[PDB]
Amino acid sequence: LVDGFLELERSSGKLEWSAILQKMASDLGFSKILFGLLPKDSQDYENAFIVGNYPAAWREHYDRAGYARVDPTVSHCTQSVLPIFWEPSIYQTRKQHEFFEEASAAGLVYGLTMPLHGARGELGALSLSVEAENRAEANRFMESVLPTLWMLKDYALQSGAGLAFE
Amino acid sequence: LVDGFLELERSSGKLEWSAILQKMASDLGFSKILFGLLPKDSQDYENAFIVGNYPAAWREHYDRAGYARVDPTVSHCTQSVLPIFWEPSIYQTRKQHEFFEEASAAGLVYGLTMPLHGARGELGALSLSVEAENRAEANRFMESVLPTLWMLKDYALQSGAGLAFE
Ligand SMILES: O=C(NCc1cc(Br)cc(Br)c1OC(=O)c1ccccc1[N+](=O)[O-])c1ccccc1[N+](=O)[O-]
Ligand SMILES: O=C(NCc1cc(Br)cc(Br)c1OC(=O)c1ccccc1[N+](=O)[O-])c1ccccc1[N+](=O)[O-]
């Protein structure tokens, strides 16, 4: 992990930094990731610094549909530093049910979101999806790597904020 | 931990919350802790929300000496989400060397500080000291529990910011 952080901090450009983070996540056993960050006091989700390997058409759809206002992980991240797991119980409204269906069609069904709150008031999220047979298999896998992920999200924040905002 | 967080969340009052947090830290191997928190935009360290079992006379000395302006972990917390270990190299200035000697006289020599950055702009620290026979032993110990501490500091923040300011 630490060696990954140092690779990130010796990277040059967004592409390489993204490559490194994606590989860290893959090596931990996640398949798709999205790292997003906004500067202090922005709610301009449509212009967030976004890194990762979510399907492009899914990212486009999310922006067009204004899903930042629906996605239950977004409001969660504005209120908490703790992880939110992608459990059925987080999708409550009608729009949130539509979101779950559309994300699932994108292959994003099992996963979690770690909120990011930076030392300079950056607001973000590190979302990570996992391929599994069922939700129970996914949840066992996630619980097994959670301590590593918990450290990773802060390493990714510290490094990524520098990249994003300078 | 999660059960520990749930206890914190069910607790009534600062006394019970502090006891639970102190017990969690003690159980992990740390004998003295300080959890400190300031609300959004405050730099009023003399009036921070403070929990823990540092010696009273040390807390009083820190406040009277204005050590929040000296303590290298404070500047670090304003710049980072990553831990800072209490290594001799972090004490650079003359006043910082005095700080190191005075803390060590309080029994606070080996340890680390986890920066706290809350979802509503809260700024703080969770500082933990370890009773060890020497720094090398202390560092072996802290490395061995770091991933648990890294989750703990966020549970403490999430719970403690509510206790402090809600
Ligand atoms: O990853 C999920 N949500 C976060 C997210 C996805 C997309 Br696509 C685009 C954005 Br913008 C996005 O939101 C963020 O990254 C975000 C979230 C919170 C704060 C700040 C940011 N920020 O800086 O922009 C998600 C969560 C649960 C289930 C499915 C998904 N999903 O998108 O497939
Ligand atoms: O614990 C250390 N520093 C933090 C600290 C100690 C005392 Br006593 C009083 C305060 Br105020 C304090 O500062 C904080 O808690 C703090 C730190 C950063 C941001 C916000 C806060 N905030 O909200 O108060 C420390 C660090 C390294 C070595 C020794 C020590 N030590 O004090 O024994």
Curated annotation (Swiss-Prot), chains A, B:
Keywords: Activator, DNA-binding, Quorum sensing, Transcription, Transcription regulation. This is Transcriptional activator protein LasR. One of its GO terms (biological process) is regulation of gene expression. One of its GO terms (molecular function) is DNA-binding transcription factor activity. The gene is lasR. LasR in strain PA103 is not active, this is probably due to the change in position 180 of the sequence. Belongs to the autoinducer-regulated transcriptional regulatory protein family. The lineage of its organism: Bacteria, Pseudomonadati, Pseudomonadota, Gammaproteobacteria, Pseudomonadales. It comes from the Bacteria. One of its GO terms (cellular component) is protein-DNA complex. It comes from Pseudomonas aeruginosa (strain ATCC 15692 / DSM 22644 / CIP 104116 / JCM 14847 / LMG 12228 / 1C / PRS 101 / PAO1). Transcriptional activator of elastase structural gene (LasB). Binds to the PAI autoinducer.
